[PDB]
Amino acid sequence: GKTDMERIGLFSEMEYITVGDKYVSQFNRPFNESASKNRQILPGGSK
Amino acid sequence: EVHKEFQSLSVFIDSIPKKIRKQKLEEEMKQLEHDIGVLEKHKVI
Amino acid sequence: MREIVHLQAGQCGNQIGAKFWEVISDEHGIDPTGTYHGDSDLQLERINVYYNEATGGKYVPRAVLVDLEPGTMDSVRSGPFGQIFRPDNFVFGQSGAGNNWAKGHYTEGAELVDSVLDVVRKEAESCDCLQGFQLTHSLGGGTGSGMGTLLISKIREEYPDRIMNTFSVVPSPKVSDTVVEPYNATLSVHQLVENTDETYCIDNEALYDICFRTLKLTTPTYGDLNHLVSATMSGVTTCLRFPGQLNADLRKLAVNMVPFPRLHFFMPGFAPLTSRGSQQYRALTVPELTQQMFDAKNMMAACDPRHGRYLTVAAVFRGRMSMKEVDEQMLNVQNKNSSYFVEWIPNNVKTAVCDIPPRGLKMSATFIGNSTAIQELFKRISEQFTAMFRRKAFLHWYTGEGMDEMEFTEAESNMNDLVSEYQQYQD
Amino acid sequence: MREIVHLQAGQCGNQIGAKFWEVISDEHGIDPTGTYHGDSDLQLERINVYYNEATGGKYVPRAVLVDLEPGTMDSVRSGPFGQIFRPDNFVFGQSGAGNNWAKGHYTEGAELVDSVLDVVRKEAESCDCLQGFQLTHSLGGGTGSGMGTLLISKIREEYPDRIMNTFSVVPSPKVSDTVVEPYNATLSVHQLVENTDETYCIDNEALYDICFRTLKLTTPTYGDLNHLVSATMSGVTTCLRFPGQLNADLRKLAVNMVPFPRLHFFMPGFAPLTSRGSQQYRALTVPELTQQMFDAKNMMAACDPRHGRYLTVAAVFRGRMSMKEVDEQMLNVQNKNSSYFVEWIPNNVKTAVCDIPPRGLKMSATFIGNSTAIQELFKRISEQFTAMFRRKAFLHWYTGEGMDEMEFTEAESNMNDLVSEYQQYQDA
Amino acid sequence: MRECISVHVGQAGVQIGNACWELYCLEHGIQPDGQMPDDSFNTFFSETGAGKHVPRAVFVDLEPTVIDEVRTGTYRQLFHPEQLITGKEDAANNYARGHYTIGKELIDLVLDRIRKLADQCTGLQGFLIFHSFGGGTGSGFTSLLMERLSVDYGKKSKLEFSIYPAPQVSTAVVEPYNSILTTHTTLEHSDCAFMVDNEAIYDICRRNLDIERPTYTNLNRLIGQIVSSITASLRFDGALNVDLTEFQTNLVPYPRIHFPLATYAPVISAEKAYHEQLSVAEITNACFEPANQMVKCDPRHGKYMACCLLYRGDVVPKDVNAAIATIKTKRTIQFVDWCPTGFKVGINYQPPTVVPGGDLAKVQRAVCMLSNTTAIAEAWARLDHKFDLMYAKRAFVHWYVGEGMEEGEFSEAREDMAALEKDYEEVGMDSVE
Amino acid sequence: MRECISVHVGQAGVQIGNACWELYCLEHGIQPDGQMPDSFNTFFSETGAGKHVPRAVFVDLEPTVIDEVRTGTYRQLFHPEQLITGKEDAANNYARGHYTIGKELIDLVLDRIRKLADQCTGLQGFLIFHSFGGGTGSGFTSLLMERLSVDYGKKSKLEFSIYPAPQVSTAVVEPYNSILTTHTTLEHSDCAFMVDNEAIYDICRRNLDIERPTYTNLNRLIGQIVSSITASLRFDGALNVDLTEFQTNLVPYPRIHFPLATYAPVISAEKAYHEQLSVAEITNACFEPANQMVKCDPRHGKYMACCLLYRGDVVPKDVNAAIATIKTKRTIQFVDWCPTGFKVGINYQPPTVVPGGDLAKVQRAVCMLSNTTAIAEAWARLDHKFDLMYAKRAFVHWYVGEGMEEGEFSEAREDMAALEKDYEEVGMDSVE
Amino acid sequence: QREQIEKERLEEEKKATGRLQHANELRRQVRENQQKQVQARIATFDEGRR
Ligand SMILES: Nc1nc2c(ncn2[C@@H]2O[C@H](COP(=O)(O)OP(=O)(O)OP(=O)(O)O)[C@@H](O)[C@H]2O)c(=O)[nH]1
Ligand SMILES: Nc1nc2c(ncn2[C@@H]2O[C@H](COP(=O)(O)OP(=O)(O)OP(=O)(O)O)[C@@H](O)[C@H]2O)c(=O)[nH]1
Ligand SMILES: Nc1nc2c(ncn2[C@@H]2O[C@H](COP(=O)(O)OP(=O)(O)O)[C@@H](O)[C@H]2O)c(=O)[nH]1
Ligand SMILES: Nc1nc2c(ncn2[C@@H]2O[C@H](COP(=O)(O)OP(=O)(O)O)[C@@H](O)[C@H]2O)c(=O)[nH]1
Ligand SMILES: [Mg+2]
Ligand SMILES: [Mg+2]
């Protein structure tokens, strides 16, 4: 059991956020989920 | 343009140089108002 | 004759109303200084509504600016159209109402409301007839939610026939710039519901949607987010500032759009919005405005109007248009998409048409709809309160300025009474 | 006027669709800027079929382009006629579809489905009367067969009264570019049976064969073959955009050529197909055209038309001409090879003459045929599918995101029902 | 108009202040003789007509060996000669001397000067009291200063930039004794108590800033950038301006619980600054990352109760909200149930300045995460074990009882922690239906 | 935006990437410091003014080859955090790269993998480069892979690996831990191309006349494969084939995921000037049972899915009549449950050249990729060598010493036999 | 349209030259960290000489 000074060299290996979550991508989000669902309010065009 | 600077001061006046800077923007325009008057009421020079 | 006293309060409001005094400034011609250097005569005809008049042909903005912190006075004064205002309307305070509804409504805010009303009296009295008031604030802040609701209540007692409008910045679902934000919003809406005539709800996330999805701006600041709110601030009041083929003033958009008295939490939207490259590829005819504005992506509230029924709608159009096309589409929108409108009201449209278009654009319109989807906006602030109130959250502040837990019970319950009546007429 | 919404989908569809807006612009006088500068008038009174109005006298194309990758669209934009389409009808996703058919139909294509639907309906309602929709794609592809069948399952359920024309490149025997291609095909016909009404199947085989053998075009690219597809895309619609003495539109071409509801699989074809050297050595009189349009070489499909019989023929002719000729020497075809025709309808030929010829050419005639000898386009994929599905072949992607196993059996059972349905009247 | 008087108690406080006050005179033009070579210096400097920007601070130690360098060093002409009040004998790591014996003669003189620095201010925003948490005067005289300020000032912001003892590094053998005694009496009069230990700084300025052998001089420069970001909205202007009282309703749960943490984001060194682009997304991930936490209490082993973002520099405000939402999708950063919210944004416009001969790099962006974590209960329980391991046989007490302090206060100090332990254990639970 | 996070592990992996990253630096205009004098995209990131950041996670348990990058000519391109060195090697030991010393670095490198991923938007997946047999290559790769899948989920993992060479090995344990790393790179490995050591020496002997070059001359040949296989995520052109395109078109049943590689225009300066490299000859050189990169006769097995990644002036008809001609010659046996068996991808950019290298310039190139059964004989020449150790208990006390249960070797043996019989029960022809 | 394209173009260059000025002022920080380390190496070797 090597000590922390011998381990990574730090005083303590305070473990990391970025070890235990899935990559959901920061590709730009369309905010609300209601931006895309069914038929929206469509008035008539000119004739 | 000296009136543009005077209206750009803060609403509160609470420090020694802000008193002083308002006063140097006070007398600079006051000596101009006395001067705009003498050159307005006398058409001939 | 009708005149509108613009009380703007709260860091947000003091900024989301300062742009209004730059857009209306340009709409009527008034330039930075305050002189009128415009073009048409109409620009300087109903200037009385928002602008007063000072010797030297200078129209001073009829606007009282209120912020308990004297720091946003320096921000609004040092702006582009910032010297235009008059100094005695800058009724500032000494201490900070740091994000707490109590120190705007009960403590330190209370010792400014007396000094605000005297200024409010001054602008109101020196006037032939008042149309009403208008408060531009943010729900979710200290001086906005705190004093602003109190300032609504005092002027509602004093002048109890005037149109009390308010452009409120409602909290957002996705992100929070404040962590006592569900507290301040829930407490405030209690005062709004019995003391206001039209409450326009504009929240930041919806402005984020419009500025990237439809406008395509990679760097939207808190300045262009206020430009869109100023456009719909201008749009509601344009048939009493400019002529038209069919006018609708502020009280006309109050009688015609509130079915039952409490149904005044509204949701706006600006019609001619194009991106930077799609502006030449896109036409300018009336059908283009009407489909873009009733659309859900151009909506200034987060609450999607397609999970609800339109109780009432207006489209205050602005442009040299034909009234029949601005009649047939309002018939077409009520016949094809005739399941998302209510049936106990046959027609749910005020088709206001102004003549003078905004600057640059040849047509425009401002959506105002009393949808039943507004309950979703208020519902969300209710679980965000009761999740906090249950395990009694930051209250060691809120009780400490001198209020009681009884007020928190009634503020939530009156807001729960509010959301049930939006569902009593939704089904 | 009568309006057609285009539905560019797939890697092929974005390309052969772009070639359409390069040919139909050249015929209608539209320029890459978008401002009309043509010489005649008749290319202007029917702009309102493919080209919508914009301020400035500008004619923006009506074309929603869809793809699950950036990919093709960056090339479509950065191209010769690529400064025409709306920036918001260039709708694209990012992540790759990767030729997995179910990925483009039951996953990621199910996020892009509403965004392309939003553009369609926005472009659909803003018309006087739509004549029909027009989606071009691949049966063996990625963002084509996967996403396209989803688009031709969602715009017909909400407009069930409108024409669904589709120019669809079918898989081939020999010219192969992908390995799971007959999986994608046999799974996409099941949606192109109950929905599409005017499916012009088209190969890649003869598109090479028309180029390197007939045109003497030395190196067939991916580009010059699309110029041939755009030719058989135009001529079908040329009686409803350009004047004529006997006009026939898409519904005209539907009713007089599809006998049973499930005969909506068709066979395309040009007519003055030539070379660079033979044109001075030849004459484009209409007696020639019939020989070069009822043959097998000028056919834009791989399937041979002498293994079967044409149930019904149509010939949308184009140019200045008489019609003793193209009515009776067209009737001579009905009499001379009566072996390759049918008898349960007496005449199986519909003529349709335009007035204005193609740009350059003289007396062209887009040849569309409905044959039972399209069957080898529909069984050779089926034998290829059964050879793979026998030992449960490349399916660990196809079953990964949701498609079950009897779905594959239905896609071959509803295939071989249609295989027997064309052979039910073959023997005759 | 917005003033913050800063009393720095102890050797740790004044040496920290020697890094904070050199930074403040670099942001504002302020030559080290207090003469500018507009109204943004009125939080940390006063003003006379000649041009003397006298700093609003009062330095106190009972040992005249660490403020006499201020009266002889290059920053002497700035500080008012009388604001630096030294003692004659130190408390010498004995809470009893600094609070009851050797601090009682110098408590009136310091409090009289804090009178004369608040008459001069229009509206006092709050206090910024920098001290240590293991020393004698950093614990004792600080404790006497806290309780007696709050009987004449009353309700006023009293923020607490302390130096908490490290988990296994210590420079004193009696640090656990002074630890318990000064957070037993400065817990009822304290509004925020920002803890920063020593070990996490050592690792932070070795991991990110590739500087082995760091000294106390480059540990306090990081502390300067903390307080220059907390007091950034007051001096300088921007969107969503966020003040001291404005913090102290958005970061402090149940009135016992007032101990937030501090993390700076763009702590990247000079060579790695090229080999990075820094947008708001990765700097707001740096704070929530436990490696850039400036306390050796592990934030992953707890739940974030209130979390206050202080952006500073070129941060376009939309990209803020996109970056915030990603952190709410991560399952590793865990938030409590009684905050559906839990973010407080603040956007200052002027970029982070660099101290010459400083170890940090020049960056356009900053975050000062003030997060109120449940994991600081780990920090207290560690030296709570240390207290109950020496007092079991009453080790270092004859120095304490022999300086005018009863031994009952020790047991009172222990049982006050057991409440504070219990509170941080009580709050974190999920309310079960 | 498209991107790929390469990570290179072991002495083999580091310098394989070093020639690869040198090659990736010369297609794009990138200088060795990283500053040009919008396609610099997948294998480069751009920060601020001009600095071009690679997307590698260079790693080794021993400091030696990594600090050569620190002191070499590519010192101001790679980061001081992108090059993650260690303390001591695993030393040809699967137990000391996966349980003791490999465990000691795995948390730090997953951070650098993840922090490198958060500037990315649309990753197709990773590019694990290693060698089967060399300790860190066997150990750390297995440790990296197991935690990679359970964290990153379904992302395309490519495993360009060194297979143990059939005749000679520069290791005594190379048929003793390659069995072990096939126990892990079998269930989280989506497609795992190999180049065993010997045949690439034979490739640079017959075709390239160059006799007796050093280590680096075969890594440039590998880098050309890496460029062409990751070419349509990059430089524009015709029909384009990405990482996801591969796995639906190369690998059969979920455990067939060990394809081969074969470059085509592996040609010297003198060859190029007097033999024309048109599409017709080039597409056939891949199917020669002497030009293919793993030293195993491809005639003994059947090809199951062939994907020909072309490059350059590769006009479409020329590949397309050609692919028929490969289906006419009968020595290449194609399995009858896959009749198509052929994918095509056409890029437009010419094959690049290192300024100093053999690899003469040519306008067309092919990166042949197939699932042949004839890689099983290489696994038959490997597994029996492992049996010849384990029967009389070879180097076992220094595998159990750093922690390893004894039955792990039997477990790796039986999954190895399971793999072996798998490719034959799928390689039996369709019988009614 | 075109009038604010140039305003949008001139806003891109001032951040482009803002980041170029960033890189150059950042370029002054590693060569003062280089000269500090170089002089320390000379200081150690001259300490050996003395
Ligand atoms: N971060 C940091 N910590 C310091 C510094 N100087 C002292 N300390 C810490 O302060 C602790 C002791 O508190 P001090 O206020 O310095 O005590 P003192 O004034 O030296 O002596 P006493 O009169 O007994 O309090 C030590 O454990 C040090 O770790 C400094 O410059 N920076
Ligand atoms: N094909 C091929 N194999 C190589 C090359 N370089 C090294 N190898 C293989 O790599 C192995 C050497 O060990 P590495 O995988 O590099 O691992 P390492 O970094 O040395 O770590 P330890 O072996 O544990 O000390 C040998 O078995 C070689 O077969 C190369 O250039 N080409
Ligand atoms: N639309 C808009 N919203 C703003 C603006 N300024 C602040 N906000 C919002 O207002 C909320 C903060 O309210 P704040 O202004 O601090 O309230 P106050 O302190 O009482 O004045 C935040 O959620 C911001 O998103 C602005 O200029 N425009
Ligand atoms: N004629 C022609 N066909 C093309 C072109 N590009 C691709 N294809 C065809 O598209 C089919 C492969 O489709 P694929 O690229 O997988 O489409 P996707 O899956 O929708 O992306 C093949 O049959 C090709 O013949 C082109 O430029 N011209
Ligand atoms: Mg001391
Ligand atoms: Mg090694």
PDB file of C-alpha atoms in Angstrom, chain D residues 256-362:
ATOM      1  CA  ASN D 256     -54.398   5.650 -66.854  1.00  0.00           C
ATOM      2  CA  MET D 257     -51.477   3.502 -65.880  1.00  0.00           C
ATOM      3  CA  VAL D 258     -52.014   1.758 -62.511  1.00  0.00           C
ATOM      4  CA  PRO D 259     -54.638  -1.020 -62.954  1.00  0.00           C
ATOM      5  CA  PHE D 260     -54.730  -2.584 -59.532  1.00  0.00           C
ATOM      6  CA  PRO D 261     -53.938  -0.528 -56.385  1.00  0.00           C
ATOM      7  CA  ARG D 262     -50.627  -2.354 -55.944  1.00  0.00           C
ATOM      8  CA  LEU D 263     -49.146  -1.655 -59.403  1.00  0.00           C
ATOM      9  CA  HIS D 264     -47.589   1.649 -58.307  1.00  0.00           C
ATOM     10  CA  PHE D 265     -44.097   0.371 -59.166  1.00  0.00           C
ATOM     11  CA  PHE D 266     -43.033   1.862 -62.500  1.00  0.00           C
ATOM     12  CA  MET D 267     -40.176   1.931 -65.002  1.00  0.00           C
ATOM     13  CA  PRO D 268     -38.550   5.146 -66.298  1.00  0.00           C
ATOM     14  CA  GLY D 269     -36.922   6.104 -69.586  1.00  0.00           C
ATOM     15  CA  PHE D 270     -35.595   8.793 -71.922  1.00  0.00           C
ATOM     16  CA  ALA D 271     -36.057   8.825 -75.697  1.00  0.00           C
ATOM     17  CA  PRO D 272     -33.582  10.958 -77.748  1.00  0.00           C
ATOM     18  CA  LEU D 273     -30.728   9.233 -75.930  1.00  0.00           C
ATOM     19  CA  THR D 274     -27.661   9.695 -78.083  1.00  0.00           C
ATOM     20  CA  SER D 275     -23.905  10.281 -78.204  1.00  0.00           C
ATOM     21  CA  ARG D 276     -21.580  13.171 -78.981  1.00  0.00           C
ATOM     22  CA  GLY D 277     -20.808  11.826 -82.453  1.00  0.00           C
ATOM     23  CA  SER D 278     -24.044  10.258 -83.643  1.00  0.00           C
ATOM     24  CA  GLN D 279     -26.204  13.406 -83.452  1.00  0.00           C
ATOM     25  CA  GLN D 280     -25.032  14.731 -86.830  1.00  0.00           C
ATOM     26  CA  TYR D 281     -25.468  11.177 -88.114  1.00  0.00           C
ATOM     27  CA  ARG D 282     -29.141  10.911 -87.205  1.00  0.00           C
ATOM     28  CA  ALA D 283     -32.428  12.876 -87.269  1.00  0.00           C
ATOM     29  CA  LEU D 284     -34.740  13.445 -84.301  1.00  0.00           C
ATOM     30  CA  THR D 285     -38.014  12.948 -86.179  1.00  0.00           C
ATOM     31  CA  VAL D 286     -40.634  11.193 -84.035  1.00  0.00           C
ATOM     32  CA  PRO D 287     -40.500   7.861 -86.052  1.00  0.00           C
ATOM     33  CA  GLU D 288     -37.044   7.465 -84.502  1.00  0.00           C
ATOM     34  CA  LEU D 289     -38.131   8.307 -80.954  1.00  0.00           C
ATOM     35  CA  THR D 290     -40.469   5.327 -80.586  1.00  0.00           C
ATOM     36  CA  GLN D 291     -37.645   2.890 -81.388  1.00  0.00           C
ATOM     37  CA  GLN D 292     -35.312   4.566 -78.886  1.00  0.00           C
ATOM     38  CA  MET D 293     -37.921   4.616 -76.107  1.00  0.00           C
ATOM     39  CA  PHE D 294     -39.639   1.204 -76.353  1.00  0.00           C
ATOM     40  CA  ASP D 295     -36.254  -0.566 -76.482  1.00  0.00           C
ATOM     41  CA  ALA D 296     -34.206  -2.078 -73.657  1.00  0.00           C
ATOM     42  CA  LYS D 297     -30.944  -0.095 -73.870  1.00  0.00           C
ATOM     43  CA  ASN D 298     -32.406   3.390 -73.262  1.00  0.00           C
ATOM     44  CA  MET D 299     -34.367   2.069 -70.292  1.00  0.00           C
ATOM     45  CA  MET D 300     -33.235   3.608 -66.994  1.00  0.00           C
ATOM     46  CA  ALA D 301     -33.676   0.281 -65.129  1.00  0.00           C
ATOM     47  CA  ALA D 302     -31.534  -2.864 -64.965  1.00  0.00           C
ATOM     48  CA  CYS D 303     -34.514  -5.219 -65.303  1.00  0.00           C
ATOM     49  CA  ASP D 304     -35.068  -6.474 -68.851  1.00  0.00           C
ATOM     50  CA  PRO D 305     -38.462  -5.690 -70.392  1.00  0.00           C
ATOM     51  CA  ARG D 306     -38.682  -8.746 -72.659  1.00  0.00           C
ATOM     52  CA  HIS D 307     -38.843 -11.226 -69.761  1.00  0.00           C
ATOM     53  CA  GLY D 308     -42.367  -9.911 -69.196  1.00  0.00           C
ATOM     54  CA  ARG D 309     -45.016  -7.630 -70.609  1.00  0.00           C
ATOM     55  CA  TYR D 310     -45.919  -3.982 -70.123  1.00  0.00           C
ATOM     56  CA  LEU D 311     -49.247  -3.777 -68.323  1.00  0.00           C
ATOM     57  CA  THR D 312     -49.589  -0.105 -69.318  1.00  0.00           C
ATOM     58  CA  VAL D 313     -47.357   2.431 -71.110  1.00  0.00           C
ATOM     59  CA  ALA D 314     -47.323   6.230 -71.008  1.00  0.00           C
ATOM     60  CA  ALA D 315     -45.249   8.603 -73.144  1.00  0.00           C
ATOM     61  CA  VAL D 316     -45.131  12.229 -72.024  1.00  0.00           C
ATOM     62  CA  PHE D 317     -43.842  13.655 -75.315  1.00  0.00           C
ATOM     63  CA  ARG D 318     -42.215  17.083 -75.651  1.00  0.00           C
ATOM     64  CA  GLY D 319     -41.733  19.463 -78.574  1.00  0.00           C
ATOM     65  CA  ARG D 320     -43.269  20.800 -81.761  1.00  0.00           C
ATOM     66  CA  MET D 321     -44.842  18.013 -83.801  1.00  0.00           C
ATOM     67  CA  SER D 322     -47.886  16.452 -85.469  1.00  0.00           C
ATOM     68  CA  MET D 323     -49.971  13.709 -83.847  1.00  0.00           C
ATOM     69  CA  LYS D 324     -51.125  11.578 -86.653  1.00  0.00           C
ATOM     70  CA  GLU D 325     -47.624  10.233 -86.071  1.00  0.00           C
ATOM     71  CA  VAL D 326     -47.276   9.829 -82.289  1.00  0.00           C
ATOM     72  CA  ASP D 327     -50.808   8.511 -82.153  1.00  0.00           C
ATOM     73  CA  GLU D 328     -50.550   5.829 -84.886  1.00  0.00           C
ATOM     74  CA  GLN D 329     -46.867   4.849 -84.960  1.00  0.00           C
ATOM     75  CA  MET D 330     -47.444   4.599 -81.272  1.00  0.00           C
ATOM     76  CA  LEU D 331     -50.377   2.346 -82.239  1.00  0.00           C
ATOM     77  CA  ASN D 332     -48.048   0.376 -84.538  1.00  0.00           C
ATOM     78  CA  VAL D 333     -46.094  -0.609 -81.409  1.00  0.00           C
ATOM     79  CA  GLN D 334     -49.354  -1.982 -79.976  1.00  0.00           C
ATOM     80  CA  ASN D 335     -49.705  -4.192 -83.069  1.00  0.00           C
ATOM     81  CA  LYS D 336     -46.172  -5.237 -84.061  1.00  0.00           C
ATOM     82  CA  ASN D 337     -44.984  -6.810 -80.794  1.00  0.00           C
ATOM     83  CA  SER D 338     -48.327  -7.929 -79.356  1.00  0.00           C
ATOM     84  CA  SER D 339     -46.400 -10.650 -77.514  1.00  0.00           C
ATOM     85  CA  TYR D 340     -44.800  -8.185 -75.069  1.00  0.00           C
ATOM     86  CA  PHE D 341     -48.142  -6.455 -74.334  1.00  0.00           C
ATOM     87  CA  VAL D 342     -51.369  -7.396 -72.515  1.00  0.00           C
ATOM     88  CA  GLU D 343     -54.892  -8.222 -73.619  1.00  0.00           C
ATOM     89  CA  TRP D 344     -57.082  -7.528 -70.589  1.00  0.00           C
ATOM     90  CA  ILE D 345     -56.938  -3.864 -71.583  1.00  0.00           C
ATOM     91  CA  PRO D 346     -57.168  -3.179 -75.347  1.00  0.00           C
ATOM     92  CA  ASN D 347     -54.961  -0.084 -75.510  1.00  0.00           C
ATOM     93  CA  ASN D 348     -52.353   0.255 -72.766  1.00  0.00           C
ATOM     94  CA  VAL D 349     -50.704   3.445 -74.015  1.00  0.00           C
ATOM     95  CA  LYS D 350     -51.260   7.055 -72.887  1.00  0.00           C
ATOM     96  CA  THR D 351     -49.738   9.851 -74.942  1.00  0.00           C
ATOM     97  CA  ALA D 352     -49.057  13.344 -73.585  1.00  0.00           C
ATOM     98  CA  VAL D 353     -47.508  16.011 -75.790  1.00  0.00           C
ATOM     99  CA  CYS D 354     -45.978  19.218 -74.509  1.00  0.00           C
ATOM    100  CA  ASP D 355     -45.150  22.192 -76.714  1.00  0.00           C
ATOM    101  CA  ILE D 356     -41.736  23.564 -75.706  1.00  0.00           C
ATOM    102  CA  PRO D 357     -38.828  21.114 -76.202  1.00  0.00           C
ATOM    103  CA  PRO D 358     -36.041  20.519 -73.658  1.00  0.00           C
ATOM    104  CA  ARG D 359     -33.118  22.895 -73.424  1.00  0.00           C
ATOM    105  CA  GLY D 360     -31.005  21.939 -76.393  1.00  0.00           C
ATOM    106  CA  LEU D 361     -32.968  18.856 -77.449  1.00  0.00           C
ATOM    107  CA  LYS D 362     -35.791  18.616 -79.984  1.00  0.00           C
TER     108      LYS D 362
END
